[PDB]
């Protein structure tokens, strides 16, 4: 048996890669991670031997800790690739960016002497820079968790487009709830007022799943984050404090300056 | 429904159509008046009930923030 | 006249959208900055009226400030569109992470009154993540523009994933050369010692344009980049010089510690 | 014949999955000639180009800078 795992783009039909479609149209089975029904179906009529890996998400109001959750769904995809199975991992966006599932099963099908790769795909960050026209180049781009921001000592530079991801769940350390409290996102402004203003205009971002949806592009002061309504899908984007200012330092040792730059 | 959602999602010629005029292409492909306005209002919810996957339920959290 | 930006990705063929390739297809006229001519034939194959950008790089020893190379590749698209020509511009990547034409573009024909988007695609640091096995979530990513690195005041947390994108120009203040020099790149080696030990070991990474092709994974003591062999399209890996630590006073803040972590 | 192979290959996953099993005899069977085999086993893009037919394609691939607006 093999593996590879493939994104779906967030967008529904369209922003599959050509490849990663023929992989998802050839595989023995399929194991799925997809926003909705629409994209489910589309998947169905591509292959019809599809496990929906949503199943592992604790139900009914259980406590699952999602360590538990990702487990499962490594071993469900690599049961299938030790019975023999020619095994496509199928997940929305970009199956190795803030998505630990693909790397592990990865990581495990090598140990045990099969054949895995990944196959990258277009995640949220790419519909984020595209929806609102940045370029992560133009003063540099910083992405860390939410909830690693508050848990570690993580130092932003406010120079740059900085996105906190999983905004919604920021602060929620028994990984056991879908969605964090208001007063843990003030604990999270606070925080950030060490380098961003109150007053410092932020972006709730959610890139559409479906081709008739706008994505939303909620600006709002940092100050007013916790009154807001978030859902697993929001991303924090933290556009720049501060203007880049010259390396007065390095340009010394290069010898040149500010006004020698083309 | 999803018939048209797919065809419109890969297809850039009925994507140019639909942003020309998105009405007059959801009636030409047989959406119904309520469909045509859930899509007008941006009300996913109302859509995903048209369609009948009324009860599916979808997490899309794959990380976490705890290391390890 | 309209504008669509596309991106190819950095795999032949195989790497774009579904629906950024039907862009391609259905438009009048294409504007592309394409890898190699593999890539190049697959274009003009899909459709046949293709303006090359590439002619507005500096020929055959000429002194140009890419400023100008980027400024007539704007002006050759916007031209078609003012024209009336439904318009697509094809880059490799994505058309918006470390490429300015597009962004350009989109802002011009939208103050002139037409119609211009970008479609996201799969840019090279979306291969590296794939490629290396690394999710940038796992503790974070920075991505600077090296030269800015060197130009501008940035401070990388030395608990991410850094990438320095166009290592091959680093200190290279004139945008008039294709390549920078050993010296320049030691004087960026000393500045990235305030945070990275000279043996640090980085990757050079470079993501494959062909289908029978492995991608550059290059790993070197951080203290033999000024020896290395670079070219225009590699990136420096930096991983992270440090393990993350307890954030306590948050941690405080929130009512938990360490052992509470799920 | 050069391209139309590694065009195919980049899109078909049925193919690519092929070739992984066993390049040189997917390279073979699509008519490639011994040098070309040689030049993809060895990793030498530049040599590909050539035998495709160049004709000195110049490929510079920058599209942005960091000197700020």
Redesign the interface.
């Known amino acids: 048996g ?1 593996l ?1 795992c493939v994104g779906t ?1 967030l ?9 990663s ?3 998802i ?2 595989a023995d089975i399929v194991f799925s ?6 994209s ?3 998947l169905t ?1 591509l292959n019809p031997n599809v496990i929906n890996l ?1 199943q592992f ?1 604790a139900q009914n109001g259980e406590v699952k ?3 538990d959750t ?1 487990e499962q769904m490594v071993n469900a995809i690599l049961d299938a690739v030790r019975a023999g199975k ?1 095994t496509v991992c199928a ?2 966006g ?8 693909s ?1 592990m099963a ?2 495990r099908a090598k140990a045990e002497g099969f ?1 895995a ?7 949220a960050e ?2 984020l ?2 929806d609102l ?5 133009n ?19 406010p ?2 487009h900085l996105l906190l ?2 905004i919604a ?1 920021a ?1 929620e ?4 709830q ?1 969605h964090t409290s208001s007063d ?1 996102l003030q ?1 999270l402004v ?2 950030l007022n060490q380098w961003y203003p109150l007053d410092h205009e932020v972006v709730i971002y959610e890139a559409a ?6 994505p939303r592009i909620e600006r709002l002061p940092l100050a007013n984050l916790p009154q807001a309504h978030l859902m ?2 929001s991303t924090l984007l933290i556009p720049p404090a501060k203007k ?4 007065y330092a ?2 010394a ?2 010898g ?1 300056g500010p006004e ?3 | 429904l999803s018939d048209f959602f797919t065809q419109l999602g890969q297809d850039a010629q009925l994507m140019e159509d639909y942003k020309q005029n998105p009405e007059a292409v959801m009636r030409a492909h047989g959406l119904t008046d309520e469909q045509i306005n859930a899509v007008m209002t941006g009300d996913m919810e109302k859509l995903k009930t048209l369609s009948g996957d009324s009860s599916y339920q979808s997490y899309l959290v794959i990380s976490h923030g705890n290391g390890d």
């Open positions: 093999s590879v783009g967008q529904l039909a369209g922003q599959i890669s050509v490849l479609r023929s992989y149209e050839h991670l997809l926003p909705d029904g629409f489910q179906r589309w009529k949503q998400y800790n999602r360590r990702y020619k997940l929305f970009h199956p190795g960016v803030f998505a630990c599932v790397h990865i990581t054949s790769k990944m196959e990258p795909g277009i995640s790419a519909c820079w595209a026209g940045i370029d992560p180049g003063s540099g781009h910083q992405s860390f968790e939410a909830s690693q921001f508050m848990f570690f000592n993580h130092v932003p530079d120079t740059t991801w999983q769940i602060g350390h028994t990984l056991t879908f843990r604990i606070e925080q799943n479906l081709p008739i949806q706008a697993p899908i880049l200012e010259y390396n390095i340009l040792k290069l040149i020698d730059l083309g």
